[PDB]
Design a protein around this nucleic acid. Structure first.
Ligand SMILES: N=C(N)NCCC[C@H](NC(=O)[C@@H]1CCCN1C(=O)[C@H](N)Cc1ccccc1)C(=O)CCl
Lengths: 36, 253
DNA sequence: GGTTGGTGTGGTTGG
């Protein structure tokens, strides 16, 4: 629904909910001169 | 996606399929946001000038998929829509302005490892995520370049938000603050764009903070995939986030 | 559809 408003919106089963990081996440997470 | 690279397993649990039922076709991509609230592009349902006016009864959502082409024996959730509501100031005759749309799916769907809902922006993540320089990634199943190529699987490109002084003197069209642009400058050896078939399709972003994915935009239009120095225009899922939660308040689940 | 495995997650070139 609304913002971050499912319960666990935008958190991926095969990937974040499972601390697996995709091919090119780190390509973005590097855009923000250094997010993480 | 042009100059893309075939997505991974569930790279987008939330990527949908606008599907025409007569004849069997794919209009565009779309994002799960509820157990039944999916958000696409209006134009993907109403482009009068090219006599585009697709109706509820008409369209099939195709949720949690990979092969563009085949029916996953048991991955895919082929689903009906109870209602489509476009946004009322959605200007077709002028410039794909306020080209957005909610369709209330006929019932709830489970969030089974490849079917999953995405974060609907907030001022915070948005405010500070949405700075040109930063990159997000469109995700779709569509033209690979501008001609008659339609891929095997979901493609994904990764691109940076582009400031207004470029996406203005980029195109003759008038640019509303209700879109931004996502491209690369040309003395920037890299490239990519979305393309005919991509639309309705999420431009999502990773918040370094709560580490969720949020819809900063949607594929809206462009002056032909990858014109070198042309940009792709997606819609400010934020500056309209208001139009959105109102409909849900008003209807459904 | 295409290399009876894969996420077209089974076992039936299909469906
Ligand atoms: N470089 C790109 N990423 N291009 C992708 C373009 C998106 C594509 N096309 C479109 O969404 C729409 C619908 C009708 C005309 N159109 C266009 O994009 C037209 N090329 C030009 C146009 C822009 C704005 C207002 C009017 C006309 C779609 O996904 C559906």
């Amino acid at each position: 629904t609304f913002g971050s408003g499912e319960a666990d919106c935008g958190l991926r089963p095969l990937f974040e909910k499972k601390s697996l990081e995709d091919k090119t996440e780190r390509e973005l997470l590097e855009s923000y001169i250094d997010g993480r | 996606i042009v100059e893309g690279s075939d997505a991974e397993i569930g790279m987008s649990p939330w990527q949908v399929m606008l599907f025409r039922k007569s004849p069997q076709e794919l209009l565009c991509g779309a994002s799960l946001i509820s157990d039944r609230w999916v958000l696409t592009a209006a134009h993907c349902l109403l482009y009068p000038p090219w006599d585009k006016n697709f109706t509820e009864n008409d369209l099939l959502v195709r949720i949690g998929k990979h092969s563009r082409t085949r029916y996953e024996r048991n991955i895919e959730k082929i689903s009906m829509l109870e209602k489509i509501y476009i946004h009322p100031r959605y200007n077709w005759r002028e410039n794909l302005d306020r080209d957005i749309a909610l369709m209330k799916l006929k019932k709830p769907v489970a969030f089974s490892d490849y079917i999953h809902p995405v974060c609907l922006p907030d001022r915070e993540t948005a405010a500070s995520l949405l700075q040109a320089g930063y990159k997000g990634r469109v995700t779709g199943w569509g033209n690979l370049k501008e001609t008659w190529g339609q891929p095997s699987v979901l493609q994904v490109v990764n691109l940076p938000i582009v400031e207004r002084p470029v996406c203005k003197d980029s195109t003759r069209i008038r640019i509303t603050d209700n879109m931004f642009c996502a491209g690369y400058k040309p003395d920037e050896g890299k490239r990519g764009d979305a393309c005919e078939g991509d639309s309705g399709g999420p431009f999502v972003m990773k918040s370094p903070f709560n580490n969720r994915w949020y819809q900063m935009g949607i594929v809206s239009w462009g002056e032909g995939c990858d014109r070198d120095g042309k940009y792709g225009f997606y819609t400010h899922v934020f500056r309209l986030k208001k139009w959105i939660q109102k409909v849900i308040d008003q209807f459904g689940e």
